[PDB]
Each structure stands twice: as structure tokens, then as C-alpha cells.
């Protein structure tokens, strides 16, 4: 019993959140957990809000989970999304590089091309691809934003500083850090490529399938494999950049309501999980893609007692992120 203040980032998420609140009210008893919606302009305002006791929960891509863990925020992962199916839940997904068929370039010929990123600091859209290309970048590689802006001939990296690094917002003026920016997130990064703004889109394995329903339309796209070859979009298991940890809901370390957060989400997935309700869907919405939780998610799993961001993410991934921030070739 009692309120979980969910942090909605911008308009579309705020609308889905208010719908969430309302449908949970209709099914959950007077003594069950309820939802309140707090709207912020970016995921960063959400991390700050939670730390400052203005909100309680927000789902973050694993790469952002690391930053949220850092002081002075010190937030921790409490609930994780899982993909695949309820039968064989996957707590990881694949980072892939989508390109158009016959565009004539491999992963080793990305210099000078235009790039579409989900957002600065995110797993598939930034950490993995930029980590792999790091030494191919021109010195000085610090700041990273400058070396990246100089490698490609223009990009859309939502949440990046357009003032200091304009080329990083060339494909999406302003580098908006929410769904208000049409080239934000997985589906936004894919639109950026489909529209012809960029040459490559750093997204996950399900993105193209979530956007193009016909196989004939998807046959016009390919994946860049690490062995400097290309494979069709269905062969991502044999052509991906890396496997990354699933998105996770984070909360305060003190007075964080993690029990209530789990109680709310567990009930939520039961009533509004995949194929559960005709009235409301937790993992989809007429208002946009990946709002509050990823559309590709099938449910939630509780994170073990007192697990910190570092242990949750793993040694490898945390090293990848570290090596990107300082990093020596």
C-alpha cells in the first residue's frame, strides 16, 4: 500500500503514465500500490529528482544505470526488464549496427559517414559502438564528444551538448533528450537512418522488426558485422556488436520504496503485461514506442538484495564504460 512517484520524461511518457495510474486504480484494491506521475525534461532530471526525494522510480538503459550509481545520486537497480519470452526470459539484448542494403561500406569504413545514435551514454546506441571504434578515432580523443564529432561527418546523438559539439546534432538539431526529438531512442535512431539523414543506426536487434512489418521492406536493410561483412537483419545472433545488460528501474538507497516498486510492477505485469488487457498495455502504447519501459520487454524480475550498479552490470561492461571515459589504446 501507497504511492510510487514514477518519473515520466516529457509529454508522451507523461500521457502513458497517467493512463498507467488510471488503469491500475480500476483493478488494484484501495489497499494496493498506486502510481503518481512526475514529468521531467530528461532522464537526468529524473535521476536528480529521485535523489532529491521528488520522485521514486525510473527505468534506465544499463549505460545510464552506471551514471545514476555515481555520487552524489547513488541510486541502485531494484527491478529489471527481461526480453525474449516468459518461458525463457533474457536479461540481456543485442547491440547491432543497421545500415541500408548496398550502401557499400563495412564497419572498418565508418570514418566520414553519418551516424544515428539512440542517445549519449546508452548501451547499444553509444557505449558499445563508440567503444569498438575508440582507437580508430583521431587524437586527441578527449573529450570523446570531439573525437566522435570529427570521425563521422555529422550525427544525431541525443542528450549531447549541441553548443560545444554541433556536428553531433547535425542530423537532429538541438540533440533533444526525449521523445520530443523524433530521432531519439531506438526507434528514433532507426527513423534517422530510414529517412536518409544518416548512413548507420546503432540500435538493438528488435528495432527494425518493431518498425517494419513486411519482410520485403526489411530486406532493404543489413547489419554491419565485426568481421567487416554484412548479414541480413534476422541474422543478428551471428552479426552483432555485443550483448548488453537489460534496462532496469533504479531507486534511492535510503527510504527508496523498493518493496513498493516491486509490488506495483509485479501486479502491473500481471494485469497489463503482454496480451493481458485490451484496455491498457504496459509494454506498448498508442502514444509512442518504448515509453516508461521498452516495447520489446516481456516482464520484470526483482534484482537480488542490496545489489549495487557495478555488480549488476558486471565486470566486463563496467570496464568497457570505464575504458571509454579514460581509456588508453
Task: Pick the piece of the chain touching Fe ion (CB under 5 A) from 121-129, 172-180, 192-200, 296-304.
Answer: 121-129
Chain positions 47 to 76 lying near Fe ion, rule: CB under 5 A, are 61
* 315 marked as part of a ligand binding site: no
For residues 124 and 136, give the distance between their C-alpha atoms in angstroms, rounded to a whole number. Answer: 18
State which residue has the least CB distance to Fe ion: 61
Nearer to Fe ion (CB atom), residue 56 or residue 295: 295
Nearer to Fe ion (CB atom), residue 83 or residue 280: 83
Nearer to Fe ion (CB atom), residue 17 or residue 62: 62
Task: Pick the piece of the chain touching Fe ion (CB under 5 A) from 20-28, 122-130, 194-202, 264-272.
Answer: 122-130
Q: Which three cell numbers stand for residue 206?
A: 528488435
Instruction: Compute CA distances 189 → 13, 39, 139, 195, 301, whole Å.
Output: 18, 23, 27, 10, 28
Least distance (Å) between residue 297 CB and Fe ion:
11
Instruction: Compute CA distances 129 → 105, 173, 203, 211, whole Å.
Output: 16, 22, 10, 21
Nearest CA among 289, 308, 292 for reference residue 300: 292
At residue 182, the 3 state secondary structure works out as: coil
DSSP assignment of 245-294 equals: EPPEEEE-SSS--HHHHHHHHHHHHHHHSTTT-SS--TT--TT-SSSSS-
Among 19, 59, 115, 123, binds Fe ion (CB under 5 A): 123
* 66 marked as part of a ligand binding site: no
Least distance (Å) between residue 303 CB and Fe ion:
17
Nearer to Fe ion (CB atom), residue 123 or residue 170: 123
Number of residues that bind Fe ion (CB under 5 A): 2
* 298 marked as part of a ligand binding site: no
Least distance (Å) between residue 124 CB and Fe ion:
5
- DSSP tag of 137: S
Beta-bridge partners for 94: 243
Least distance (Å) between residue 247 CB and Fe ion:
6
Residue list for the binding site:
61, 93, 118, 122, 124-125, 186, 247
Chain positions contacting Fe ion, by CB under 5 A: 61, 123
Amino acid at each position: 500500500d501507497k504511492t510510487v512517484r514514477w518519473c515520466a520524461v516529457s509529454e508522451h511518457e507523461a500521457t502513458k503514465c497517467q493512463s498507467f495510474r488510471d488503469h491500475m486504480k480500476s483493478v488494484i484494491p484501495s489497499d494496493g500500490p498506486s502510481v503518481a506521475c512526475v514529468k521531467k525534461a530528461s532522464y537526468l532530471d529524473c535521476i536528480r529528482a529521485i535523489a532529491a526525494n521528488e520522485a521514486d522510480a525510473v527505468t534506465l538503459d544499463a549505460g545510464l544505470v552506471y551514471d545514476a550509481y555515481l555520487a552524489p545520486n547513488n541510486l541502485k537497480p531494484v527491478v529489471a526488464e527481461f526480453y525474449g519470452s516468459k518461458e525463457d526470459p533474457q536479461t540481456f539484448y543485442y547491440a547491432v549496427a543497421v545500415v541500408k542494403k548496398d550502401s557499400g561500406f563495412q564497419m572498418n569504413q565508418l570514418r566520414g559517414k553519418k551516424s544515428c545514435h539512440t542517445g549519449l551514454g546508452r548501451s547499444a546506441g553509444w557505449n558499445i559502438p563508440i567503444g569498438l571504434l575508440y582507437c580508430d578515432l583521431p587524437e586527441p580523443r578527449k573529450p570523446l564528444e570531439k573525437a566522435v564529432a570529427n570521425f563521422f561527418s555529422g550525427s544525431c546523438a541525443p542528450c549531447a551538448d549541441g553548443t560545444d559539439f554541433p556536428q553531433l546534432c547535425q542530423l537532429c538539431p538541438g540533440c533533444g533528450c526525449s521523445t520530443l526529438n523524433q530521432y531519439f531512442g531506438y526507434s528514433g535512431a532507426f527513423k534517422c537512418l530510414k529517412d536518409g539523414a544518416g548512413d548507420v543506426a546503432f540500435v538493438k536487434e528488435s528495432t527494425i522488426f518493431e518498425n517494419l512489418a513486411n519482410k520485403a521492406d526489411r530486406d532493404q536493410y543489413e547489419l554491419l558485422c565485426l568481421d567487416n561483412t554484412r548479414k541480413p537483419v534476422d541474422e543478428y545472433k551471428d552479426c552483432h556488436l555485443a550483448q548488453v545488460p537489460s534496462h532496469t528501474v533504479v531507486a534511492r538507497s535510503m527510504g527508496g520504496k523498493e518493496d513498493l516498486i516491486w509490488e506495483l510492477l509485479n501486479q502491473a505485469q500481471e494485469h497489463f503485461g503482454k496480451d493481458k488487457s485490451k484496455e491498457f498495455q504496459l509494454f506498448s502504447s498508442p502514444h509512442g514506442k518504448d515509453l516508461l519501459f521498452k516495447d520489446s520487454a516481456h516482464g520484470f524480475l526483482k534484482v537480488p538484495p542490496r545489489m549495487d550498479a557495478k555488480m549488476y552490470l558486471g565486470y566486463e561492461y563496467v570496464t568497457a564504460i570505464r575504458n571509454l571515459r579514460e581509456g588508453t589504446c
